[PDB]
């Protein structure tokens, strides 16, 4: 055991917690990052945003190379064949440089990076013991003298009791991005949006996918016609729903190579089974804290299992802030980055801020869903009198040049002073035309404000520019 | 002779006309429309915007598949080839499309649309004449008597003196648009916007393109870097430049079925003989008020064959208007259908408004290239201290996952007020990124104002919000 000392000690090095290592050092903190699985970037960069998004865009080349190639006037007088191999090696590329990047980047920074596992010592000590196999780990245990720790823990997949989750047959999030063959069918659990994006992919390159859901629609959180209407343009893309309908059990038959899956009908109790090559297992994500010693110290944990914090990102001890996934709000990777942010400049200034009015949500499915603000059921659920402006992207010139118009922009607006509550876009380029709407909403700029601004023609963003006109005005072109 | 009586009445069917009869219509105006081509949309629907983005966007794909889908897991073999007629359809098919929806937008609005040519009777009135071989035309000469007229006659290929276009052989951009076969070579003139475009659609498609440019950059009014930037990468992709470098004269060769060009170095003042299959001649665009019968009214017209306005639009005859690419400011389509709704708003409220210092400018080449506001050179030009702030895609997550790294965002800022005066982006979706720096600049953000706003992750727009962290702080990614 050997003591070390540093101003900052942040735990995790996902998200919140590499970034706020970043901030912390270029703040003039001697700072320090523990993590224990080997690489920087957390569960986002090594087993979920990264790899899933380029899992989502290789797979969309290949269904427009493969069924869009010719309408566009490219002959190919051979096979478009999906190359499994190389398909996972190119993510798997993404993921090694990437993961290089942020290593680069707390060395050029002087953030000390230990591998290891870290623990609360105490209140104000954190011990970093070794990791067996993991190479680079700590030859001993490694006890920090520290003035301020971060919590950034993250997350884990929520376990199915019941069902052995092996990442082979019946896989996790982790498993379905690592897949060695496509699947001749695919069943999934849940159909949150981790759930629906696997399901994409896969349906792409040619399984038949099945989508069990408890509840009547999906998306769960997205606004309600745009959830309906997601739902509907995926079923058309070839997946098939089966919603009001919970799946029971489910265990790999061996001898037959398939899983058995046994599912009940909500509106009817009435049991059923099936099958599938591969099971995908996505009923959520929690927050993880196991060989955190928290309960050593008596960091409070509410009943679902979150770190609890007040607007300041403490817990009940001043010196220790928790960030991310571990804690409140919705678990997305931006607003890790910003909690992460935020809670480093308070201990610098003594103030930070995160707007969570303002956190946009976004599948990257073809076409992507992206919304930020509030919903019509939240508008209505709170007796807000609003008015609607919506832009069909089949009415963009750009959209219809590209010979893909599916989709639409809606934009809520208050009927009284026609400021912007909310955003919602199913679209080619929802997830970053919807950075248009965060400036606007930030800023708190009326329809009009937007309305007003000249956007480049012949683009998508047009489209927001005349759904906005359509909120407070006309539009032009519909 | 037919008469009748109209509030307002435009002359122009292309984006700043139509725009303009759309929106009369909604405030309330009888109006009419005068266009004598025989489809709605102008230059940009019919021969510009559209079909180019078009063949962009098919010629990118091609190309994708033939050097980016075996990295990304795609196996194509055999011949990938292009089906000109069909790659022309395609392109065909969207400008029918589109022209047929303006046509949809007017019977909806109840705008009143002249097949002819219009032109002016006295100041008060215009006469529609019939067109020779015009489907629909007028069967009669119209005298319309108007409250209110507005000119919209946009612009034409401007001709280079000694040189005869063909649109076979010798073309403008028109011809280039509908060749028949892939030129073994093609030869530009001119590396303007349009010049680029075209040269890059048909490089993708095999011919070798080679751009003769009087100065010594291309682009016309890009950013110093980003000019240079934009070069590199062309010449990168396949084209060849000659800089500094002006044509004298060409001419058709029917024997060896090539066009015999004569260049001259600006630098040595020694003349070089070119040759290639067909040559482009993008020398520019002019205004076109042909036939309008300006001159019965004697309407003011420039120099540069524009017709002067002042800054309300107004020509020397207060009820009658000029708009768009006849007259003064950047020759774009978003800029023209901007002024088409400012006049007509002044004739309504007595106020429009074109904020001249926010137009976007895009080169839908790939990567993209956009930029507003100020460049670096203006800011120099002006005395202006200035901070900026600059991340490579080759950092962003998005851009690594797609495998679509080349390009940056660089943003111009106020050393003093740290408030953004311009953004400068090559990168795959600049065109479309650009509206943030839009929504800034028109607002009055500072660096700092967008770099707080959270984006979503992972996206293109997160580079957008690091060029802005570093440009007043510090990236965190970089
Ligand atoms: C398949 C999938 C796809 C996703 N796609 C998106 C998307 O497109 N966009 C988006 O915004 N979000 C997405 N997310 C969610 C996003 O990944 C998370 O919100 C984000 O990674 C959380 O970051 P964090 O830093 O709070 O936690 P995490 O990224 O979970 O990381 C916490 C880190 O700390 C380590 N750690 C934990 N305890 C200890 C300890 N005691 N000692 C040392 N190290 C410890 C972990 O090993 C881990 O690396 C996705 C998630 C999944 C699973
Ligand atoms: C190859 C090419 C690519 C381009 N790409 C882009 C791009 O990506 N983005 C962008 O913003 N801009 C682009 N532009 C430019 C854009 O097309 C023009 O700025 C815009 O179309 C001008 O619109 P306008 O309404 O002022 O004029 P125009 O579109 O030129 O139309 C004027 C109209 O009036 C008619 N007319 C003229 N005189 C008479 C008369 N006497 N009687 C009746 N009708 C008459 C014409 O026939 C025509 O339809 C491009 C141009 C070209 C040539
Ligand atoms: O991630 P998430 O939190 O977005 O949603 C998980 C989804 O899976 C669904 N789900 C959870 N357990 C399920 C089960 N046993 N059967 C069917 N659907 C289930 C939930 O209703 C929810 O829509
Ligand atoms: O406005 P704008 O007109 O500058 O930009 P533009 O967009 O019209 O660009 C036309 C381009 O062609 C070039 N050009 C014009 N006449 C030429 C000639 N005779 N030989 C070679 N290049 C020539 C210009 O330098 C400019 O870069």
Known sequence: TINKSHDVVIIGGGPAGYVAAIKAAQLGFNTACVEKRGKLGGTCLNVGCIPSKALLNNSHLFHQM???????????????????????????????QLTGGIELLFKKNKVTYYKGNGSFEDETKIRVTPVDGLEGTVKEDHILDVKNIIVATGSEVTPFPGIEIDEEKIVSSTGALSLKEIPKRLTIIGGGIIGLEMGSVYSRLGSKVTVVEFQPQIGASMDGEVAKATQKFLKKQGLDFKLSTKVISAKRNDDKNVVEIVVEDTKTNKQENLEAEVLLVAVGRRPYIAGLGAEKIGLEVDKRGRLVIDDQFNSKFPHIKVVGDVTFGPML?????????????????????????????????????????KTEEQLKEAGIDYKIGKFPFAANSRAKTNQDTEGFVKILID???????????????????????????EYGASAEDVARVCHAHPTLSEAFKEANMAAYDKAIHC
Chains 1, 2 share one sequence.
């Open 66 to 96: 493969h069924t869009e190639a010719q309408k566009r006037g490219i002959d190919v007088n051979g096979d478009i064949k999906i190359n499994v191999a190389n398909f996972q090696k190119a993510k798997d590329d993404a993921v090694k």
């Open 333 to 373: 990777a931006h607003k890790a980055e910003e909690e992460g942010i935020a809670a480093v400049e308070m201990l610098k200034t003594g103030h930070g801020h995160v707007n969570y009015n303002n956190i946009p949500s976004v599948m990257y499915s073809h076409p992507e869903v992206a919304w930020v603000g």
């Open 415 to 441: 009927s009284k002073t026609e400021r912007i509550l909310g955003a919602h876009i199913i679209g080619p380029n929802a997830g970053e035309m919807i950075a248009e709407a965060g400036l606007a909403l």
